[PDB]
Amino acid sequence: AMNNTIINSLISIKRSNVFAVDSQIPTLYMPQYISLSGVMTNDNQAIASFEIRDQYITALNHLVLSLELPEVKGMGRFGYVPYVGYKCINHVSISSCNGVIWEIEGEELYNNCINNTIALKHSGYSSELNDISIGLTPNDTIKEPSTVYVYIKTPFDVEDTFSSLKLSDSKITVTVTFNPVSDIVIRDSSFDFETFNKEFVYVPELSFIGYMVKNVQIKPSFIEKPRRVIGQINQPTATVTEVHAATSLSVYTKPYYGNTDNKFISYPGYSQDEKDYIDAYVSRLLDDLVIVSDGPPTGYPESAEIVEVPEDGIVSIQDADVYVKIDNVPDNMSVYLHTNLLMFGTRKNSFIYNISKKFSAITGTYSDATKRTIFAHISHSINIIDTSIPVSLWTSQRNVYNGDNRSAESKAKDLFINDPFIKGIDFKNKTDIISRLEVRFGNDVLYSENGPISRIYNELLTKSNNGTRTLTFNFTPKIFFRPTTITANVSRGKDKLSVRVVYSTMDVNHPIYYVQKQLVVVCNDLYKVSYDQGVSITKIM
Amino acid sequence: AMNNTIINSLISIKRSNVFAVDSQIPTLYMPQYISLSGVMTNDNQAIASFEIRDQYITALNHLVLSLELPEVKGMGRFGYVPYVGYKCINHVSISSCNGVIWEIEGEELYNNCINNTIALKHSGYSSELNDISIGLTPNDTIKEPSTVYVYIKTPFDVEDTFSSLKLSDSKITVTVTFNPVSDIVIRDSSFDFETFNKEFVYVPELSFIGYMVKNVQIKPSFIEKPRRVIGQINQPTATVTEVHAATSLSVYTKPYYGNTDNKFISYPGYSQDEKDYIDAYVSRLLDDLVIVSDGPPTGYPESAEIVEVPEDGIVSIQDADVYVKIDNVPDNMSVYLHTNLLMFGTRKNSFIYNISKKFSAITGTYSDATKRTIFAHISHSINIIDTSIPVSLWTSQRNVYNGDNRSAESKAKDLFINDPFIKGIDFKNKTDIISRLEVRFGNDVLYSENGPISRIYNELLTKSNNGTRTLTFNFTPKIFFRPTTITANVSRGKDKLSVRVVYSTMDVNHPIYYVQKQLVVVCNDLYKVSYDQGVSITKIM
Amino acid sequence: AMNNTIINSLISIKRSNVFAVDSQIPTLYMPQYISLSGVMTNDNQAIASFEIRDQYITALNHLVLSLELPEVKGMGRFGYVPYVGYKCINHVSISSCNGVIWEIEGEELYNNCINNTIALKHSGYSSELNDISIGLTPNDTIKEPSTVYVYIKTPFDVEDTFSSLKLSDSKITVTVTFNPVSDIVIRDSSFDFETFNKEFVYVPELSFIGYMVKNVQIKPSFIEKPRRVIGQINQPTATVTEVHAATSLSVYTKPYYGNTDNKFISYPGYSQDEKDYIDAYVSRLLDDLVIVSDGPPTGYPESAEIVEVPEDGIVSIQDADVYVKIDNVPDNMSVYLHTNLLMFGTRKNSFIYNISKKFSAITGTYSDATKRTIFAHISHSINIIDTSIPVSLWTSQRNVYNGDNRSAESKAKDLFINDPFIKGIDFKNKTDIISRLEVRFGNDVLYSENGPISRIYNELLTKSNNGTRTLTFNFTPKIFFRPTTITANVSRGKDKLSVRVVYSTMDVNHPIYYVQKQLVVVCNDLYKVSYDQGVSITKIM
């Protein structure tokens, strides 16, 4: 029922038809899902190799790696890192008889896939995998066997068949190097990690979409291979040499925990919000913070200053006042507040970082049935950095105090965490430790910034939530155009990308000041793909 | 402020202009939102017919069906299934004078729209609709009147005006067949469903975007019509005949509850996470699991083994130990543990499935004001399958035990659930009951897999979270190319798609072993659309 | 490993190659992120001006505005509105020597960006910014300094370099007008807003992506400039004159709070779900609703009817029964129910809106340590409208009752909220106050609807969750085609868009009946962009 207004509004010119189109008949082809088994060899890293050789496979894309995780038994606490499938991959390489066609580091693969929620979920992200489970007997099953699937995104996936890797009758080999299983496991000290590690085995299977094409017409294309460079420990510089045609440049920082035992007080498991991290940390602290006891509590170091709560409920810790109210406290028992649970300082009369001063209100109810306090509303100022401080840093040699005044029961619940893709200096990469960034191409300054406007642009343009500081040089559509690059001038000397940052200033009495940092620079170089005598790539100069 | 580096980096060749384009003048047209009322007729299913006849409507797409849900009154418990608007649709057909142009089943329509969160939300997904409400008097209003909107996605929507259905001066009729209202309602036994069902009436209105086009130039196009085949009860096979040009093939399993009363213990209402299902189930179980009583609890079957909790809090149920601690228990009362609340077994001395053994720690506080236990931390191993077991299966004839030892008050809270789009054998389609899948085209094997790598690929390629095992044959862009299909060879005999699965093995002492299953195969056939003497389609061969 | 079925299925015709493409070499260019500082001037609104003048910048797009929010100190309660960065912008204008090239209102900018979660998050959406913080001393830091980033989406962003604004050697000026800081702040009366407002200063920096293009070839393009018209207070009409080529028309309603003090009882801060709003409101009400007291509670107006709860727990308020059970009540104390906490009525014996009657079950436990009630399960019927009623409306002159019988402590916790982008008559724009909508073009009726099917279509087509009633006239692809518009017929008189709504009927005894409403109509006009003697636009007629 069109209105008279509508039928009279339209009341000559060459007009493009937007209500019809001629359907082009495409190249004749037939796709097939193909699964292959690999040969494992053993740095002694595990390495899986897959050989693709079939005259009827003309092209392929969409590599998926499946992994069988085994049943885990015994006692102790044990979970998997989130996205375990991606955290397992150290390196991936695709190569033909002519050499390497494409390759990537596992962290860069994860960074490229981090905006793909479906892929992250298939990589193994669930409560059954990522909760920290407990075994009570040597026969208790901590984790049941399960299979995860890792989508190995390549440049060959962007335009479906248009960008797919053509096999010009050559053999194609895919090689997957794995990280050691310690990287993907979160465990306490009571778990028999030596036995688990001696018995653990990666079991991979490779899948891809193959294309049988009739009368294929191959043309040369353009591919981008990421290349990574890691700076020295705590140095504010890193240089990428032999840069002749780069499409983009990425910069970020990784913490280095090699000077520690890799032990942390808490970990939220499947829950991965900042609030979840903080809630897990606070839950671990409260068991030692407020104590209901018949007499002064026992089982703490001599350095512990445990103080009885007065009738008004306020315990003053220097300038800080902590409000403590516990219901149903027995008559033969008092309420005590640990006033220096964790403390750090560099001089005997300077500023002290004291975790007890971060709490302002603690309320809960005591349970006579379970002999413990069930906490309710907690008012505190604990941030993600406190949850990210390694346990070794509290008891460092630079600390003029004891450091860790927790009970032995609390110290036995600390977890080993060797997650290989941690960015920044906290688990969420929230704190921005870069205050200034300068990028040089040759001797001349290419780009400078103070605030993270390059990260803001990276996130806006890629529609990601976990972006980094990225200089993007290509804004042209993929595949159909040759990508735009910054191009070297060897005569002028402009053929390397030097990066210099200024790190943010931290308090020398904050434990986080001593986490070691490395600067990571990623450069995407442009390559040309040719299909004469097999598959070949050349670096564009 | 361009840097000298930038202005000297660019320091001939035919270059495509990527900073400008000539704006093509499109076909002259004017869109209008048009709403129509239908004629209802009454298998006795309701059927709504809408006639589109207007010489000035040249094309249309984007069908939306609105439905007025009436005010629900009375007593009992009552909610709507999530996405009630889509759950209401049994069948949709679009046809002209020449015959059916396009049609789909309601479940396939839901499957095609499941990745559209906006559409699912408009279909009716809110707490006011999907919470299980309670009426206390015969005049209490359980649900207020509300309107839902169902987006009926067709092939005519993919490329906006390019793919829109052209009305070549013909009459177009849309016919909507509805499911019976029992399918979309979740109620207990105290709700007067007979009266509600006698008085309920579907009230639909149809909307679409029409296009008045001046001097339209129509061309023939290609359309895909899904076709479904349902296998026999508990058979591992299903065949699709007359397959001459298919773009894709989908496979999944549906549970068949016809051998039951369709009653379930719990349902989470608006909350639809797996954890929400499990929490609702546990909340229903705890009211009978742990009892605070003055003397041995009364009101349970003679088969119930209710045991007093010792002072240490551990009750051993065969090999399983349950820890029970309840605060504030009165002095004249004890704490009791129901040790066989639900139990299933096939032999008198074999394995027993016992829901009481799935709990390891139960803590809470008794309330003297409300005479009930408020539970706190619960440690258990309840999975989604337990929440999906029908109540009839516990009391089956094959069970050598009583089965359901709950109280009458608990049994009166069970809910009828007839949701028509359930997949798998649980409400979340999480358990994978297919262990092996083989697809044959003619006599030859087209595809085999063990793990669900085809489902992994379906989800990756369609960016969905609720994918199925799907063989996709078309990777060419829609509309602008003729779609790629697997093509029949009638000379060779290759003209049907046979499907055979191997179902996963289950424990004969698990109640879920006896849920009946059907195999569903969906085949998308390619059709050609022509515009001579009205609108016509032909099957491509 | 291709199957024999696959290799025999494919066993002439001009076929388009879908496995290769010739890579076109694009225009030579180099992008750069450029940041500028502005000149501030002071309706006395702050205004930031940025001058872009550089012969080597050929084109630009992707404007980002950063803002430094200062440290907030003192006592009282203080937070920022969600998306503070967007809420700060009153107006944005881009202009060259020829005049205004493009401009938009801040509310329309927010509406265009509301589907961009990344952009909304960068605008300032976090607990640290949006929680309502408390200062206790005149030196307590309520908020730490932080920087937000506002993505100013323009038409120049849709097709990357294709749609970018060309600077034809002209100077380009960007002007940002800011809202007063009262609009972006949520505070109580104890916060020193006069001092904060005297000292607050907007500190903006502008960024954009510039393009140095070698041998650019510029062509004329088409741009759409939104234009807004606001109807008179409580009038159901609004007209847009001089409409000669419009691509779309939007309609919605804004509440007008100028007849109030802009004070509300509660606000959920960072949590922005409807349930969060309702939970914050209920949490504020419960502290006065149920009172544990030694004797009749004191500190309430003489109009307050506070009633002791009987032993059965049921207090009847006219036809409504409230169930109140509180555990651990001391022996020298009773439980009391405030039965007319908030009440509104227009006649002394007609219907009364009473907030106490909206509660059906209240349970909790009294705390002897903190002298307050910790509530548990609450059964109520509080909706978002109750949470959106302004405090002034309860104590209106039309109310024949007192209105607000809360304690002084509760009244001191009310918050000032001047959020400038509120739609509808509640904070979530959930209630639909438009029952019928008629759009006229000239004298003839262009479109009519009752239900919000135009909003349903707006949301479906734009993939948004916060759509409005929108008539869309353009369904052609952006940039590459000249947009489709409704076109004026000045001879016939069709050159204005008149809008008339019928507002929904409300109860004259509901306080929400008296919130004043304005009708907002937005019309997107089509303009042509030319590049002779700088940058110029002309209105298409």
Numbering used by the authors:
A (entry chain A), B (entry chain B), C (entry chain C): 0 to 10, 15 to 45, 49 to 547
What's the publication's text?
In Vaccinia virus (VACV), copies of the double-jelly-roll protein D13 bind to the viral membrane via interaction with its partner protein A17 and assemble into a scaffold surrounding the viral membrane. This process leads to the formation of a spherical immature virion (IV). The 62-kDa D13 protein exists as trimers both in vivo and in vitro, and structures of the recombinantly expressed D13 trimer have been determined by X-ray crystallography. D13 adopts a double-jelly-roll structure composed of 8 antiparallel β-strands.
We purified recombinant D13 trimer protein for structure determination using single-particle cryo-electron microscopy (cryo-EM). Initial attempts were hampered by problems associated with preferred particle orientation and spontaneous protein assembly into honeycomb-like crystalline patches that consist of rings of five or six trimers. This problem was mitigated using holey EM grids coated with a graphene oxide support film, and the cryo-EM structure of the D13 trimer was determined at 2.3 Å resolution. The refined atomic model based on this structure was largely identical to previously reported crystal structures (average RMSD 0.495 Å). However, the presence of the short N-terminal tail α-helix (aa 1-10) was inconsistent with previously reported models. Our cryo-EM map showed intact N-terminal tail α-helices in all three subunits, with or without imposition of 3-fold symmetry, although reduced local map resolution and the increased B-factor suggested that the helix was prone to dislocation. In our structure, the hydrophobic face of the N-terminal helix (M1, I5, I6 and L9) was held in a pocket of surrounding hydrophobic residues from the adjacent subunits. Additional hydrogen bonds were identified between the side chains of T4, N2, Q35 and the carboxylic groups of V451, L452, and N2. The protein solution turned turbid after dialysis into low-salt buffer, but examination by transmission electron microscopy (TEM) showed aggregated honeycomb-like patches and rodlets without any IV-like particles. We found that the N-terminal short tail α-helix of D13 is critical for in vitro assembly into ordered structures. We propose that repositioning of the N-terminal tail α-helix away from D13 toward the surface of the lipid bilayer may act as a molecular trigger that initiates scaffold assembly in vivo.
